């Protein structure tokens, strides 16, 4: 399994955490509902936009995801720092 931590800000994070820091379930990257977005998995293959897993494809502060809450487009995830 991929390590469930980040050594920096999560550029290489490839784990399976799929909830945001507030506990919201992540929207699947291959879904455009409830939030339409441009992070198309087949368009950014090296970013590993798999299932609804938190990812940091874009030099965000840490891995994040779109959320299934219509009133919350996206949120950071709580990925621990590696020790």
């Amino acid at each position: 399994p991929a390590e469930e931590c980040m050594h920096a800000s999560g550029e290489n994070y490839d784990g399976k955490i799929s909830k945001t820091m507030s506990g919201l379930e992540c929207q699947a990257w291959d879904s455009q509902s409830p939030h339409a977005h441009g992070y198309i998995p087949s368009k950014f293959p090296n970013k590993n936009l798999k299932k609804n897993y938190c990812r940091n494809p874009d030099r965000e502060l840490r891995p994040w995801c779109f959320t299934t809450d219509p009133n919350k487009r996206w949120e950071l995830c709580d990925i621990p720092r590696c020790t």
């Binding site: 441009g38 030099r59 919350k72 487009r73 996206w74």
Partner: protein, 34 residues
């Protein structure tokens, strides 16, 4: 490039998140004031 498209998408995410925050703030103001 793909890197520049991702940076554009990130900036758009940040803009939309601030507008979400400001809207919630407007409604919280109304509830506190009432």
């Amino acid at each position: 490039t793909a890197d520049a498209e991702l940076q554009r998408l990130k900036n758009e995410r940040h803009e939309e998140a601030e507008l979400e925050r400001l809207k919630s703030e407007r409604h919280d103001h109304d509830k506190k004031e009432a």
